[PDB]
């Protein structure tokens, strides 16, 4: 609960922001996309295609509990599977990196819009803080650094 937890959709650019936020604050950064792929042995993309998003999200939800094992404060990029998460706020201060749907869509249909709407509601229910992604990585970073001050 002094972990800084970047949460948001996959493709939102949280991993890269995490990297740069760690560097700025002299903190280690952990990316649950990385851990899950490292431990499962398959790429994010293969897990998504062969096992589905619900199972990615399960992988993530099980890693969260382990992440409270951490003796030091970390930047943690996670939340690609918010559907399965109950309250990652118990992991630390969570920042939702909020991107509009059309912009998320470019970086990666009525059914996708439906999903996006439902999951955004979960992200902001799980967020201690909201960072507006529209302005790009450094403007998101400034936002996070301003919350910290």
UniProtKB/Swiss-Prot annotation:
It catalyses: shikimate + ATP = 3-phosphoshikimate + ADP + H(+). One of its GO terms (cellular component) is cytosol. Its cofactor is Mg(2+). ATP binds at residues 11-16. Pathway: Metabolic intermediate biosynthesis; chorismate biosynthesis; chorismate from D-erythrose 4-phosphate and phosphoenolpyruvate: step 5/7. GO terms for molecular function: ATP binding; magnesium ion binding; shikimate kinase activity. Keywords: Amino-acid biosynthesis, Aromatic amino acid biosynthesis, ATP-binding, Cytoplasm, Kinase, Magnesium, Metal-binding, Nucleotide-binding, Transferase. Signal peptide: none annotated. It is an enzyme of class 2 (transferase). Its EC number is 2.7.1.71. Mg(2+) binds at residue 15. Its main location: cytoplasm. Catalyzes the specific phosphorylation of the 3-hydroxyl group of shikimic acid using ATP as a cosubstrate. Belongs to the shikimate kinase family. Monomer. This is Shikimate kinase. It comes from Helicobacter pylori (strain ATCC 700392 / 26695).
């Amino acid at each position: 609960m002094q972990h800084l937890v970047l949460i948001g959709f996959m493709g939102s650019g949280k991993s890269s922001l995490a990297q740069e936020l760690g560097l700025a604050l002299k903190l280690e950064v952990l990316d649950t996309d990385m851990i899950i792929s490292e431990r499962v042995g398959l790429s994010v993309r293969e897990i998504f295609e062969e096992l589905g998003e619900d199972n990615f999200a399960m992988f993530e939800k099980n890693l969260i509990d382990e992440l409270k094992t951490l003796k030091t404060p970390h930047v943690i990029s996670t939340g690609g599977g918010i559907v399965m998460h109950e309250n990652l706020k118990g992991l630390g201060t969570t920042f939702y990196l909020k991107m509009d749907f059309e912009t998320l869509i470019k970086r990666l249909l009525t059914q996708a819009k439906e999903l996006f709407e439902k999951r955004q509601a979960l992200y902001e229910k799980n967020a201690s803080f909201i960072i507006d992604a529209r302005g790009g990585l450094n403007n998101s970073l400034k936002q996070v650094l301003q919350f910290i001050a």
